[PDB]
Write a protein that binds this ligand. Structure first.
Ligand code: FMN
Length: 179
């Protein structure tokens, strides 16, 4: 495929969303939703376009063994690609979180994921408005706007489809989609 779709998940929501995204694209436009659990750093570097999802766990951290995820995830995968350069590549990020139970850490993992690739020279697209969200602070917020799509299936499952469709429409030009 042309667009690499990757995600990290412990209870399956981020995965659900990922498959939802891939639901509207070709097996030539986008690859299947893949868990970083089984991705080779070699297989990940091949994509010049990336769509990445991640929830935020224990202590506003990325899912992984330190955050008590059942199996490995973003935390352990990042070190495998930290030596990779993303200059000239395009990335879009989407995070899930619970704004009610974690008003001061809503989507922090998204923030950390943002920096990883941003620090690598990647072109990042898909900033999202904070309107419609109840939270106090987020490390995923830069200049009063989310660095990637903000989702909450714990308290706002009702707006997921609406949010996801609009976000896709928003990033389409940057991913050479006809959308
Ligand atoms: C121990 C625990 C800690 C969490 N901490 C945060 C947090 O700091 N910030 C946040 O925005 N969401 C937090 N969440 C919410 C999850 O990220 C959210 O439920 C998500 O939908 C789970 O995604 P998953 O099914 O892909 O694992 C936390 C959830 C659990 C169980």
């Amino acid at each position: 495929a042309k667009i690499g779709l990757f995600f990290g998940s412990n209870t399956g929501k981020t995965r659900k969303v990922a498959k939802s995204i891939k639901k509207r694209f070709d097996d030539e436009t986008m690859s299947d939703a893949l868990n970083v659990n089984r991705v080779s750093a070699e297989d990940f570097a091949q994509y010049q376009f990336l769509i990445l999802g991640t929830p935020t766990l224990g202590e506003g951290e990325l899912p992984g063994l330190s955050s008590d995820a059942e199996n490995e995830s973003w935390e352990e995968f990042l070190p495998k690609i930290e030596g990779l350069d993303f200059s000239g590549k395009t990335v879009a990020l989407f995070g899930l979180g619970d704004q009610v139970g974690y008003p001061e850490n809503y989507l922090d993992a998204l923030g950390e994921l943002y920096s990883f690739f941003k620090d690598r020279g990647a072109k990042i697209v898909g900033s999202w408005s904070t309107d419609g969200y109840e939270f106090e602070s987020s490390e995923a917020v830069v200049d009063g706007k989310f660095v990637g799509l903000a989702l909450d299936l714990d308290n706002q499952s009702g707006k997921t489809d609406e949010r996801v469709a609009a976000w896709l429409a928003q990033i389409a030009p940057e991913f050479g989609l006809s959308l």
